[PDB]
From Swiss-Prot:
This is Endothiapepsin. One of its GO terms (biological process) is proteolysis. Belongs to the peptidase A1 family. Keywords: Aspartyl protease, Disulfide bond, Hydrolase, Protease, Signal, Zymogen. The active site is at residues 35, 199. Residues 17-328 form the Peptidase A1 domain. One of its GO terms (molecular function) is aspartic-type endopeptidase activity. The chain holds residues 90 to 419 of 419 of the full protein. The lineage of its organism: Eukaryota, Fungi, Dikarya, Ascomycota, Pezizomycotina. It comes from Cryphonectria parasitica (Chestnut blight fungus).
Amino acid sequence: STGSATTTPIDSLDDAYITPVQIGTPAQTLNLDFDTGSSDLWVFSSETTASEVDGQTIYTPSKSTTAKLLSGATWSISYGDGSSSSGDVYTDTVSVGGLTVTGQAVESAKKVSSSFTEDSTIDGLLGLAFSTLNTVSPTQQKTFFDNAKASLDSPVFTADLGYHAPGTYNFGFIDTTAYTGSITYTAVSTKQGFWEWTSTGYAVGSGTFKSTSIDGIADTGTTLLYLPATVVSAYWAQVSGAKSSSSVGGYVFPCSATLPSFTFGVGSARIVIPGDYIDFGPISTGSSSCFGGIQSSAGIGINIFGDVALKAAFVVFNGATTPTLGFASK
């Protein structure tokens, strides 16, 4: 089997992407944030504290003929941005882009933090990291990908995120029309439960490539590119008037600037992030200070190849017995 679903930016900045997901019988379609940096499929629901729901579509298990309480199971998760959610668990039928899993754990939120409530466009998360990170207790649950894997034509999914445009998540096949040149594959460590890999270096604009190992994670659920402070300083030093602002919480730059590209290495191959991808617009409405899309990972404890980086590539998440990542230009 295969599946193929379109993923759509939630706003004009590509702050996140949402993908429609069918849950239950008859189908309830929720727009979920596919997150290769976490491993829980959780939704706004009929159980969510009413004051914490503001415009989201909810899952109502009582209206699904295939929903079953997973008795005694609870979940609770905290993300890198400080947000959180928790609740109880149902099993139900879940379909993505025509690919169906029966018996998927659907984590129903009883509580969500303010950043979830305030984002009316995201109805929950669908985690695509390794199932070792899933938070369900006392019986850990599998991701949608892990449950689908054995049925897929190939044990893979791909992320093809758009810049200010829709893109695609495919399951079980590699669309050879969706990228240019060849795919370069690189090793993955699953020790921390992430799609963790090592980039071979970077370049800023038309500058020379610096060969250096940068360990980090491929994380579709993170907006920005978080890299070591040395790398990030070298990038922003090429932008007149850019500075790190402790009041704003990262590097800002004049909205009048033209940003240089940023290249990262994948083995001997190179992915180029155009400068425009690094502009996250005014820090507050009407400001002439703009927020940068490349930020320091200092204090986060890991480098993160978030959407800024991934949207410049066609990315293969290879879930074979020995997982690997693939990157192609597009």
